[PDB]
């Protein structure tokens, strides 16, 4: 849930252009040509494992809901197997589907299953 609303937090920030905390039709209109947050949280609420949730929480160091490459390398060095840094980026290229340089819970669970 907390990583889930972390997805909608940055999403709402992507909708909110002026950053006033609302989404107007003009902000919605600029989206269509390219094709509140509790209001946005309530609206997306009707639209929507334990160990995996436990696995992600020890992995994401800052708890932003998004594992970076340096967090992964720090885990990979904590794993104890030697790897260079280029294939770690390929691991991000393997998992980051929408291309934000990040992985959420949903990109993580499609990788594990």
């Amino acid at each position: 849930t907390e990583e889930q609303i972390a997805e909608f937090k940055e999403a709402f920030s992507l909708f909110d252009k002026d950053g006033d905390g609302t989404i107007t039709t003009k902000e919605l209109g600029t989206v269509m040509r390219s094709l509140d947050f509790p209001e946005f949280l309530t609206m997306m609420a009707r639209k929507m494992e334990e160990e995996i949730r436990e696995a992600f929480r020890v992995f994401d160091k800052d708890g932003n809901g998004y594992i970076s490459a340096a967090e992964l390398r720090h885990v990979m060095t904590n794993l104890g197997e030697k790897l260079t840094d280029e294939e770690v980026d390929e691991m991000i290229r393997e998992a980051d589907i929408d291309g934000d340089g990040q992985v959420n819970y949903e990109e993580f669970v499609q990788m594990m299953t």
Partner: peptide, 14 residues
């Protein structure tokens, strides 16, 4: 950048 895929599913949900 303007990644369309992050926008498509959320506006589609809208």
């Amino acid at each position: 950048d303007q990644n369309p895929l992050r926008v498509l599913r959320y506006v589609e949900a809208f």
